[PDB]
Symmetry: T
Subunit: 139 residues, 12 copies
């Protein structure tokens, strides 16, 4: 374990904690969203659950493959007092998730990790899709 690999694993573990956090947040939002648009927003929140589950699985596998230990401790979920807030906090969570992945991409690239760079580019594309959609919903 190089220093760079140690620091990449610490990063992936941050990513994984953020992914478990998102899974919790989206279940919570699917359960609690109210008013007529609940009929709209619940399936939306629910669809994000499966997506993030797939990222969580990929990350914990990669951590283990690199010789690390995958965390089981999620980041905190911000408490949303209404639907606007629920969408803004999901958007901010996505923004931070992408920021982290961009950093992880330059870590992976720097270590010549081809498959991991491709996958981080794809997870970036995917989370940017979600964030851009939340912006459309909000504006």
């Amino acid at each position: 374990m190089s220093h760079d690999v140690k620091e990449l694993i610490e990063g992936l573990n941050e990513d994984l904690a953020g992914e478990y956090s998102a899974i919790i947040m989206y279940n919570h939002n699917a359960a609690t969203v109210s008013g007529i648009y609940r009929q709209v927003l619940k399936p939306f929140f629910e669809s994000e659950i499966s997506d993030e589950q797939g990222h969580a699985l990929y990350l914990a596998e990669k951590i283990k493959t690199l010789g690390g230990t995958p965390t089981t401790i999620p980041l905190r979920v911000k408490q949303a007092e209404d639907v606007r807030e629920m969408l803004e906090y999901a958007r901010q969570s996505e923004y931070e998730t992408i920021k982290r992945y961009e950093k992880r991409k330059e870590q992976a690239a720097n270590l010549n990790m081809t498959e991991l760079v491709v996958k981080l580019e794809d997870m970036i594309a995917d989370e940017t899709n979600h964030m851009e959609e939340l912006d459309r919903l909000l504006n």
Copy 2:
């Protein structure tokens, strides 16, 4: 909010924390299980994820419906050092989940909550199914 309703909500919130914990545990176990039986056990762990997600959703909805606030903080996941341990700790988690639900059933019954009793009986039946299967795998 009666005292009994307050205490039932505290209980449901315990249940919900335990459900988010199980979702984390099962993703973690699907990612990290190794050896030839990984091919067997990963889909098993994965199937439990969707099940527990449905319980988490039901509970957070019910908590909100009863006037409470659903938690987003999961219970800790016990760290498993090998596959036997992974199965024993999943079994123990299920055992505690059923113990809690049995208590919640007598709370719900005591408040004449028909739909909630039916649903707790079903979640009990379902988790007992899983626990009994883990026993078959272990023995």
Copy 3:
């Protein structure tokens, strides 16, 4: 035909009239709901149609099985002048349907009717699900 069986049949027949009424109400609401959320609410109303159809079928079968005659006369549908009213009147109809089923459950239980109690508990759980959802839409 005991007196108790006669009174249980009268009850089931009330239930059946209320179920045909709900089928009418939900078709009517699917047809007539307007504004942008029509796109949301029409499928919701439509989904309730099939559910209530299944209850209507079960009840008329049970009535006949107990030696009664199943009614073909529905309860009146309250006329809704706007969408809020449409949701409140559907909610109230569900509330009355559950009240009746709870009474029928204690009738069925009192006559040791196992299969019928299980089914009334399930129809209670199901209608309570719908009513709780309408509350989320309304609040």
Copy 4:
């Protein structure tokens, strides 16, 4: 609202009452048909339910679109004392439904209502299909 449009709406409302009546009749017949051919006839009755539901939806939408108020009061269902009667009364109900639609077609045609004429021609074709099948079953 012309006089002709008023009279066309009165007609559609008759049609709609007859459609809710048919939905009730077919559920009732699916529930209550007996003997070995119940295995044959129940699915037949059940299939007609969904068909008539689609006509009910179309009519209530059209009534509202033309500025009328869609009824929620069904026609009476004739009480059938045996299977032959059940098939004869379903056949007669279809016969009356087609008679009404033929009248509505000449109303719609007279008002140059293209889409409505096409749809009444199709509902006529569809109900004639059902009536002809009932004749095959009966003879």
Copy 5:
């Protein structure tokens, strides 16, 4: 193994023998039913096969889980000389199966066995469904 658990296992084993017997009976009836209604009754008999297979599986699993040995010896199948008899003997077999399950339910309830009571209530509901249908076919 308490005395009560021993006696509950003896009961489940009776149930299991009766379930293998029903699986045999229904295959036999699907094979041998004749006349035009064979086209009706064969799929009916066939559908019951899969149902009873699922009960057989549940029971043998539960027996093993409680520390017993699941039997592989079925009850006798009554020989049916014609279709009426075939339906009456299937009905009687269902009647006896429900009688046994009701007894097993009070055994399971008496031992506070939540999941097993829920499952026996469901198997009761399911077999009562089948028996009631056979009555409709017969009358």
Copy 6:
């Protein structure tokens, strides 16, 4: 090529330009609709795309079959500054599409073109369906 056939082809070509225009408009609206109801309206717009594609295909085939040349130049799409406008302009486009098809129907009828009249009647019914739905969304 009669004069009447020439004039019918000119008409179909207008229709085809209007159909390519609608395909563009609906893609554009699916992409650009914003706010929470985007979740509702995007699938709606998207569904209209496939419908209009099928009309475009039918028309270009018919034009070619009648000896004409199908245009590839769409009508202009009106620019919508907000969601209300987006729905009003889609409604107006549908209104003009139906007006044109009604004219084409009397052209086709006048030339005894059976299959083409049936198809124009159906496209009229279909576009009237869409226009009536837009009215429900708007009112």
Copy 7:
């Protein structure tokens, strides 16, 4: 009924008893198999159930068609004390089933029974497939 047909029917009836026995054995093995490979072996056992059900149905039909009476009495199931034994006894049961079918094939061939020979050849091919697979699992 020739002597040869009588002896062929006795044979088919042996086959049928052996098929009901296999259906029992495979349900029993699906229920009771334990350890991690239960996850592997249960679906395997379960798949054999449907296969043997189809042979049981074919045989009872053929017996009846030839003028015989199909048995409802299964062969005994050997009791397996562990998984190795469970696989060896399933293998031996298949071996005996094929031995019998080979004998039945020369009976059917000797009576010029084309369709029955084709079907016995296919059931032989199918059971040999299963037996060869059990050998792979065992070795």
Copy 8:
């Protein structure tokens, strides 16, 4: 073209005429069968249509492959005055179809035509299945 190949082609052409005849007969019977069991028998007749279509296709292909010309002239269909007759004449048609195929099998075998023998054995098995079913319906 040997004499044997010429005579085999004449045979296949008889078979093909008989197959087109069966396709006609079964469509005719699906259309015209009456009374309550029409609901049973129409799908049965319809299923035979697709089967015979596949035999017709195979035969015309084989005829062409052997250097012959496939006929387009069907055998006559016997006119059935009621349902019993409809089933007896379908049974007799199947009987004659199998008789012919058995003859064709010994022709194909005699010319060492492996693939054709396998296929005639299968078509024999298939038509014998149908004939045996008709016998069950009739008796």
Copy 9:
């Protein structure tokens, strides 16, 4: 039976003979078409089979419903010596089928037969679709 109904039945019977003829022709063409485009044309021919089967069924049902006897004697199939001819003769057959249906439409219209006119208009539209496609293939 009016004279007009007699003459309409004679017409339908012509139509039905032409439909059985088309079913034969298309099977024959699917079997015998050769060269690389066989891969293209066989599925095309095959798709027409199911279409014409549905027309044959409708016609024989209608004939019987009007009090006539449906024919089982097909029109002759023209023998095609190559693929061009196969497409030209299918096209000509379609042309004659449409000519007949147009005549039947004015017969049905003249007798005020709404459902039958709608269905003949649809069969006309459908066969014109096929004929126009054959023209595209040929030119």
Copy 10:
């Protein structure tokens, strides 16, 4: 809006006009392609329609997200006088589409736009797939 973002938006808008143009071209080609290979080429053209629709949607969304206005004006479609030309002009259109996307990729890369680069690389891969296939068809 930087100068670079303005110039990237102008580029995307070119891309979008080219995508609407391709959607028109492919519908047009699906409608108008003739001769036996129409059966081959029509589904090919049709498949490209859905692909390009997805690119059009992505681009208009991205334009809006970057603060631009998505165009609704397509590029001209080159008129193809025969099938060879139809394939050459589709190929050339794809060639120009890829040339543009390669330029847009270096624009997006230059602005560090990760998700947009990934998506342009994918659209490049996809259009290159189509162009290479057209080359195989042409050569």
Copy 11:
């Protein structure tokens, strides 16, 4: 291992080498076929891949079951300079595959190997199907 079993295994191993060769050939032909009919022929070649894969699997399993070692060395693939050649060489490969299987059938028959004879007869029927189709494409 008898001499006959040794010689049968040598034969199966020839068959297996020929099957891997066919899998290579068909992938190669799917990749490289050109001109407009590529759209036709590529799916054809592709379909043969899965078929031959299933034969390869069966053979290697049987070889191992008989105590032999399955080869991993394919026969050479003849290089095809154009589409005609590609079809002729696929046809010749099929011809040789059938010749070999016919020899293997008389080997298997001679050793009384029932299941293996049935399977070789089926693989013969299947490859003869393919060869006959190639002849239709070529002629």
Copy 12:
């Protein structure tokens, strides 16, 4: 053909030989894997077959597109004497496949081949997925 293109084609041809080799290896391993985990490993091996088939197809197409000739000669398959070896040799084969693709990526990148780089990055990601899974199975 530049020198660089010649050397890139030689590389792709190495890749293609390695892909046909993997297809052979995985079929061979699916056929021959033994013991209880055969039930686990056979589907795993089988899934890799389809994956590698898709790479083989892509490569042979690309080789042809670049003006080369795609090889039909596979690399040798290492002979595995047991399951551990089977997994280690599959892992090593994947390792060498990725090493080659990484080299091909820098060749493709060096020639500015966008679509080919994207596809090699994806095939790298995909094979790395498989190799990492084999490591989990092995450790």
